[PDB]
Amino acid sequence: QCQDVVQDVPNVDVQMLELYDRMSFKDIDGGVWKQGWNIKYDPLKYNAHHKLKVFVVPHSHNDPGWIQTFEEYYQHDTKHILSNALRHLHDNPEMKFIWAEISYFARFYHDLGENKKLQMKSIVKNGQLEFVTGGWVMPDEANSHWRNVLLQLTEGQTWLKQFMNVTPTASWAIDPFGHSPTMPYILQKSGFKNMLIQRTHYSVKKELAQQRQLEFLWRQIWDNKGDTALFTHMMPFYSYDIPHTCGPDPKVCCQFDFKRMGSFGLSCPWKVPPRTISDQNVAARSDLLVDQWKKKAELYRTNVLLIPLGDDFRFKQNTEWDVQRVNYERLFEHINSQAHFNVQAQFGTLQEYFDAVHQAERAGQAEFPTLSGDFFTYADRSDNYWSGYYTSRPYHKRMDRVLMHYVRAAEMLSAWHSWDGMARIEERLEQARRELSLFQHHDGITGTAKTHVVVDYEQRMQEALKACQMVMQQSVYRLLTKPSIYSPDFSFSYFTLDDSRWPGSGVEDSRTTIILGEDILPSKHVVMHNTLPHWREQLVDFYVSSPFVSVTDLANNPVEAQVSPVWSWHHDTLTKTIHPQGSTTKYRIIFKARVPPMGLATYVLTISDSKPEHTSYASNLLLRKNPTSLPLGQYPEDVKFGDPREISLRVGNGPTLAFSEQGLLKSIQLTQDSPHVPVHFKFLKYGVRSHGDRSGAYLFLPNGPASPVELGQPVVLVTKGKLESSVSVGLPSVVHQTIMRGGAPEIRNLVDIGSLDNTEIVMRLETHIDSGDIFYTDLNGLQFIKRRRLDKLPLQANYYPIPSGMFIEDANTRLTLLTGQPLGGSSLASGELEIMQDRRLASDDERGLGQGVLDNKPVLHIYRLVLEKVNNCVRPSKLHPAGYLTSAAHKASQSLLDPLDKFIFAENEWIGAQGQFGGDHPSAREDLDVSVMRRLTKSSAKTQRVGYVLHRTNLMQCGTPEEHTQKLDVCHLLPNVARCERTTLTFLQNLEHLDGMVAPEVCPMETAAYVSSHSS
Ligand SMILES: CC(C)(C)c1ccc(C(=O)C[C@H]2CC[C@@H](O)[C@@H]3[C@H](O)[C@H](O)CN23)cc1
Ligand SMILES: *[C@@H]1O[C@H](CO)[C@@H](O)[C@H](O)[C@H]1NC(C)=O
């Protein structure tokens, strides 16, 4: 049945880790093709019976924000490009154009008058204007979570199906900074047949070009059979611009960019301008151009050649459409009429190219190689590796993951019911999906936009978060109120969300205190939501106005709780120390919530005059020389003081952690009898070069290995409780916290790089683990890929995206660091892991941004740190390119990305309150997730439809007996099911009508989508 993703090493023609191991990466001057060689061809290769078919594909690369905001670019550029495309294509039936970014197209189309909408539909229907990919954006592939890549793809394609009646099956990704196999994974499961990529390391382009392996069947690294394969075309040259798309010599190709003759303010840096094509020069101009084409064709296996014709925000003015079209028409008429060239050239679309390639393949003229792996870390030239943007603007990288989860929770919570249009549910969800989707752009989440554009993305995401909160809290109120009592005001806040980790303590004072008192309000209901499809327990905390608070479930059963102080860290500009202050009127109450699969659970917080039976109080110990008092109001335990010293902590039966006198982890002891394993946290700094190329938003160009941050004698705070303990230390630029709840610790860093120009702050772990040169990092939160550190490459080349986790291991021991935000990282020596926290760069790095990164703001980064024995685990063989998490590490990642949601009832009394929702939902096996639950129909539809995306990961077998769990059939989650269909991941095409209306569970590493239809 299911493929084995662990024990069968796929046999592929090109495996990128193996290729990397072999390649020398020499950066030699190749001639006019600076990073290649002087291409030679046999003029006799093409003849009357075997012609070269050339497709010139006009395009315009439109960024949804970069140097201008989305709306600024729309007003200044994109609306004119689309208006003039409509006119020019209408009037010139053989002209063609491709379009990628549906965020822009949807904005444009909705503003068109009906006559023009109809004209637009006609040029799409007739194949002149073709959508490529059809996502809301052209996303980053490094930092983006797969769930959000799918979200934005679905947003654009759903719009295209509704308004344009088309669904692209070819993808175009010319600008993201390196490429991920997560893209073909999602695309192939969304109906695609072909994809195109561009930004891959120049040494990779050279190597693959030499072997004619630039077109390949790209399969996943674990896929033995090849069912995940997607045909992929990699472009061969340095850029997608016209100089780098006609052939290997940009001095020649630039002369065929007819916008560069002067009047448009553009020119050719190779110092030979374009000249207007005429009868007196067409033969000569054609001989130069066809020669470039035939050289390019040498790099590929068929007689069908792709020639993109475009650049950033091109095809804006009428005069530009004319100058490109008329000159190319003259070239085509000459070339096609002169038999000696043996060429047939025309304007075409991307799909037309791929269709012709596969026709050639089926005619037996070519066979294509198979490939697995990724295309990180990209370098466009010399030692300029683009690993900086794995970290740039980390506040917004963290915000991405928070909004990811809020969109999921809002769509899921509201899916259970049909809503009246007056509730504005669909409206708020569309807004939230679109703002999160926009941020997936390769200048959004990447942190590579101008300051004011970053602010625009942030404002949009803030509005999206508020939209999600509104939908979530309306849904909770409906799900947990007696039906005959429920009386909604769709504008009212029945609950407010409480989020302990966003924006975070020390970032924003955003959380509401639950105010209780004998003379105001004795008690408060709170509700937790669990978006995961299994029963889950998690500690939750709330701020309360008294320490004398106890917790009950709605059956009035006492729940054990812990109260701790509210501690805030302050950079004391008088004493020049960083030290914690405690509140004398707010306290934290902490208790274990237990919540059904995809469900809700209600608890009550009640005040009393004195210490409640079932609530304990943490001790607090402040370690510093020169302490001063720390009063805590009614908090019943006095703060203790001491000189800095090593300390050890253990919560529950979990690990025992030892810390240095500077408050940093030094060892983990898994069990009572077991060893104290060395695991040391350290903070270091990278700088910037004083000569040569400077680091900026894209590039990481360190001035050598990192240097330790000088710590001084930092203040350390130890809080010890029955349920939760922690060690926090105020370091320069980082308040570092290790939190213990009885399992793997949680690490939080409040990172404020302040005014430290030209500094990158890294967090490193040093261990004994004999990892050598191997480490593992994830791709888009979907899969873990084996990395090999290569000393033949510079330090920055060995940095990779850490979108959600990384690990090192030897025969016996593994250390895994899971993240709540994408950041850059590496393992630069055996036994180490490191991950960048923030970077502040004074200089521009010459990729068009025109500024450094000087807009840093405090960010709360979150992690889980999992030390495990793996000697008993069934792991892939030494040649397998993948790795897999254990159950504990996977659950730890879920605790970061999809925590319980917390709701505080706003009013004094909740009439008709219920204790639970979802107690009857199946508790699915731990490796299965309902990644998406989305109602697809509005309330007017007689047949309601609900869509589910189901993802099964693969966890290592390590000898923990499996306990029986329940089968999850998503098609029966809502009553009155009438049909169940397997669909593409975007929900746009029905693939299978399912027997018995039962949606089968998926195989390890597979993702499927199902839609259930309901008659009532
Ligand atoms: C002229 C010079 C300053 C030397 C320059 C060099 C390279 C680039 C890009 O690669 C820009 C690429 C690559 C980086 C990316 O941020 C941008 C935008 O998305 C836009 O679509 C083009 N993208 C730009 C300028
Ligand atoms: C939409 O596309 C399909 C496939 O070509 C076609 O059968 C259908 O009639 C089109 N719908 C409209 C309204 O043109």
Ligand SMILES: [Zn+2]
């Ligand atoms: Zn771009």
